[PDB]
Amino acid sequence: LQSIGQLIGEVMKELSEEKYIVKASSGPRYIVGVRNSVDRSKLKKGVR
Amino acid sequence: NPLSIGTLEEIIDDDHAIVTSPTMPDYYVSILSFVDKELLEPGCSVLL
Amino acid sequence: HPLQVARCTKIIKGNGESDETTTDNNNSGNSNSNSNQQSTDADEDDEDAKYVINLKQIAKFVVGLGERVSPTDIEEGMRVGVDRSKYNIELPLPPRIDPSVTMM
Amino acid sequence: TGRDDTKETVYISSIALLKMLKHGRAGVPMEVMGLMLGEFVDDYTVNVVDVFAMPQSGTGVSVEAVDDVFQAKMMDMLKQTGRDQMVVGWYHSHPGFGCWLSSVDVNTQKSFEQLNSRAVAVVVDPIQSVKGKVVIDAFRLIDTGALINNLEPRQTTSNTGLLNKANIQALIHGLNRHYYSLNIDYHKTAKETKMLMNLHKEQWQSGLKMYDYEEKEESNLAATKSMVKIAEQYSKRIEEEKELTEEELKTRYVGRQDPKKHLSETADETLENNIVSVLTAGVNSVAIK
Amino acid sequence: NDKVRFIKDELRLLQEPGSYVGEVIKIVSDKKVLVKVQPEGKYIVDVAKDI
Amino acid sequence: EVKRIQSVPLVIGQFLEPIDQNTGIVSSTTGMSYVVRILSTLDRELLKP
Amino acid sequence: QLLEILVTELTAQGYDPALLNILSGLPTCDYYNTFLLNNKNIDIGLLNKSKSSLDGKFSLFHTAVSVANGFMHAGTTDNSFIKANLPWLGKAQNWAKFTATASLGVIHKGNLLEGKKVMAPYLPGSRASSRFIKGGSLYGLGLIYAGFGRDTTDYLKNIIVENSGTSGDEDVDVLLHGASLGIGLAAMGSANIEVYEALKEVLYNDSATSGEAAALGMGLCMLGTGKPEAIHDMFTYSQETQHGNITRGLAVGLALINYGRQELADDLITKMLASDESLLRYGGAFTIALAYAGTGNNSAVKRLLHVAVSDSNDDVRRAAVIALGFVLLRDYTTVPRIVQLLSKSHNAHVRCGTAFALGIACAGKGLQSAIDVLDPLTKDPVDFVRQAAMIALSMILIQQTEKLNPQVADINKNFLSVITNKHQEGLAKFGACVAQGIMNAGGRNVTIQLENADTGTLDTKSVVGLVMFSQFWYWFPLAHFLSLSFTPTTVIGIRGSDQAIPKFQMNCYAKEDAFSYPRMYEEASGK
Amino acid sequence: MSLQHEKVTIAPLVLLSALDHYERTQTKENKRCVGVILGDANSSTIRVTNSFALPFEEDEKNSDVWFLDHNYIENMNEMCKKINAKEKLIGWYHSGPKLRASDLKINELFKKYTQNNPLLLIVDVKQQGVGLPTDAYVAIEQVKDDGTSTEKTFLHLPCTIEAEEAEEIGVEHLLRDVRDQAAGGLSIRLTNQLKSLKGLQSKLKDVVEYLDKVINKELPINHTILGKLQDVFNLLPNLGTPDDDEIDVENHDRINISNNLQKALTVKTNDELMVIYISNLVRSIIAFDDLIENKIQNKKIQEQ
Hints:
The structure is cut from a larger assembly and holds 8 protein chains of 8 kinds.
Chain C: E1 3-10, E2 52-55, E3 60-62, E4 79-82, E5 89-92
Antiparallel strand pairs in C: 1-2, 1-4, 2-3, 4-5
Chain E: H1 2-15, E1 22-28, E2 32-37, E3 42-46
Antiparallel strand pairs in E: 1-2, 2-3
Chain F: H1 2-6, E1 10-11, E2 13-18, E3 24-28, E4 33-36
Catalytic activity (chain D): Thiol-dependent hydrolysis of ester, thioester, amide, peptide and isopeptide bonds formed by the C-terminal Gly of ubiquitin (a 76-residue protein attached to proteins as an intracellular targeting signal)
Keywords (chain D): Acetylation, Hydrolase, Metal-binding, Metalloprotease, Protease, Proteasome, Thiol protease, Ubl conjugation pathway, Zinc
EC number (chain D): 3.4.19.12
């Protein structure tokens, strides 16, 4: 209850190393940030 | 202010009505004001 | 007002739904109990016929029993009024626009 | 008559600001509950010294959303450490909506009015706040008797009378038939400020710290080429640029998003950077050996 | 002074809320107009102070 | 201050046309067609299309 | 001060009782009352339109109209305010009601014989409903008898020791706020130490409203003494006390005490701007203002100018500008040059203080250049910038005909226009109404004189008027202190042999109608 | 068990809370505010997320007497798991600034609520240091060298303030000062560079004093300090090597690029001058025109 859910999208296109175009399942396309925790080597286009 | 367009589907005989909005939801509303159910008729567009 | 209008699409009994799942199995809990055999940790939940409604934005919710009527009066295929956000039957609505139509 | 009925200046301490943001942002997308503990003085001054978060409720914010077991226990703990204060209000969030009280929240204010009739209700959005001045407003009820007979306004006397407001929506409807809004005043000392400014000793150690010189050369390289390429852009600007009306020249020769301004910034960042790098190097030479 | 002031005034416009966009279908008799808000439904709404 | 709003998180939309240099009309990907203010010292030499 | 010691010396030398009575101030009051009594011009039509627009159902509106009309009918006892605004006065509530009782203390100013008598049914022990009426009469008494009566002080001192043994009741607090302001005025420049002790108790209760009132009341009395016991007490007590209404008042209160102290207040000033409370830096700005007033000092002009810009609080900016025109009082033509930058500002509060500064500085006589500056500030889209400019304009161009100077014509119609419209904001409405009251004060024969021109030397009383006047944002009825800065302007022939006013006529090379009274502000039956 | 505490990140919530809490007990004159700190632990990065007071007394007559209420620590745990389960006891703040040996024994107590070694977070509330508003130490137990016994001791482990993201918003709101050190423009960093030299120099002065007291006043040799100093002498720049010579060539390389930029601006600044004089040229003509134009205006009034 204190951990809380999360939202899924897919990387629609790489904007920058530190900026990504994701398409949310909820609805709208977003520009998001990259957390310290997720590495940019993992990030790429078309990955969930 | 503002006033949303509505439509009057039917009148329920207890000074209430069933209305259908331009938004996806539909709603159980009270009949109010100077306009009565005698002055209304079903299928007429009404201000909510 | 406003009670957003929904409609029953399923009678899922309240003691057959398995609201509790610590000691209860999904198929049924006892069929007339759910957590009245548990009083070792104090949690209470029984109810009869909780219904699944379908909203007109097409979202489904398990909602309350009638809070201004008896649940006998609320049926499968009967429209109902539920709160703005607290989604719990207060008032039933007739089962559709069927009277008068049929009788002609 | 009777009560003064002028809306308080709410002075929220630094501790209480940051604490509210901490519990709100972890909890999104959900509502949060909590009680505000302070001291009330004067006839219109509440000082909200501290807060405590009431655990996350399963029905959301309502009039049942304080459990009396947590509440009693929680205040009892403040009494054992001398941090004790009195409930002077309550806070709640709407996580996705700006500041206002729904029907339920006003009804909660009616309950807190019973306990203290100068009570505040503070609505904190945790995510909409990027300044942290914004989307925090406090509300306090104005008497019911006051509403009916049109003696409702009496909040404009005995304040600054500088008001800050926006939105019609729920906000305004809430205002007319119930409560009155006034800005959040922030109180601090220079000991809280002093703690923030420091961020270790590596703050100042880094001024001496010199990067890779591989990086400096790269930055300076990029900048050199950039100024040539923007000088050409600037050459187009002065291609003639003597035809009438300044506005038609701005659009035509790209005087909007000016190449002269762009050259200027580019030069200055690089000029000043290399100034510090030569200085810190020279500092290093003489100082160590 | 001109420059700092402008950078802050554009920020103030962002912070204050959105706008939408309709087209006037007809004029109604309370000094309101029937607008069809183009991406949503209709709203009947009061004139401006310039309109 | 402005730099922060400029930066993430953002919601994508699509520029339609100007209606004024400092107010344009867009449509968001949430589904809502919004009239929106344009921050100055943005490239307006590619914004217009 | 100088009058009081001179009366004592001449009675003890032995002197005729005419000269002695003159210095005591009884004949001068009387001559200027008679002048108002004879030449006053009432406008009822201003009251009824003012009233109508700015209803007394709304608390902020009630405040503007009340102050305006108090100045309108000022200096003579009159029934125009009372009769016209009789259902409207009954429309008040809360602290707007307090303002309205004290509005009678402006109206009834001088008329010394009738002075106790006129406020009498509104006093404690004649009133038994509304605590606001009981409090606002004592302040209304205080205003009438300001800098006059040494009889009056004692009545109020009796009330004060009565009411400062009690603090637990709200009634007692409202009542003792009006006693405490009243006594300061009544003993303004008396420097009497007994007044100080009585009101130190009032400060010491930690009351919301009587503590601010007491801070102001004690500095008015110890005006310009620079006594080091006072200097210690009020500064220390602002650290101790963390009620922001009291802290503010002690800071303005200190500014008062250290009037005309010059560089022997330079030590006190250092400490006030080095404080971390926004209240003390605000009152630091008037500490420079009053210490070095009307006098060229390098320290004074440079420090305010620094404070105005550099500070990280917005109130402190606003204040330092108002302070700048107090330092540059005598050199009142140089203020628009400096404050052009401050009119042009990005800071709302900077701009608000700029309008007030011209207001005060160039108050004393027309200066067109100032107006040219304030014309943009009138139309500025910050609301409180509007409120400040609307007010300031009327003080500079005070009681001059719409024909004599055309600029007056525009400025009057602009205040009216604002009042007709209802889409205008409340702050804009306040300033407009109030400013019209500043134009049309005293029956239209009064001006604000910053100094007496038979000697060219500053009037002690006026300077202190404008500091309290300027502060009204944080405690609406301090507008009333403007009484001290208006002075009737008139020649009064006097018998040197009978001491009575003769009628006779003089030659004056003049135009025939340029210096006649302005025309009327009424027309609504033409429809 | 783990010995993992290598980096200690502090939320600014912790430093302002310790400031309040000292004053809500009113401890003074080497009486202390001892409370708990919560966060995450059993990890390479410790994030100190929260702080609370506890009941606590400090006796000046003997430092081995203090009070602590155990029942308070057990009851506070129940509550905090409901607000946030990512919060757990990770150790204790101590007001300081003086670290004592009796504090090792308080330490043992806190080792019975957390698996890891407890973190003792010295937060100076008296604000005597112009830097270090956090110093962090962790008790570890090790055989000390030089014929010395097993000592239980508090070793320094790196800490820095870094702030949470949710905290940040308020940090931005409350800082409305110009910031003398913020790392800004040319101006801001010339003020820094000077500040930085006096910083280091004072730090260097403590080392001198320390060394003297070892052989004068016979301080205990702590060979850890002395080991670090061997490497200080071993990372000294030595002149006359080809490295130093390349660095002096590089100062000219960098100043070379600075020179080209300075010329380029001289053209912008002269561009602005040219453009004003054109305006003034025009304005001379416009002002001249008014004089002619009056005649034209005057003539109409007479006619009409």
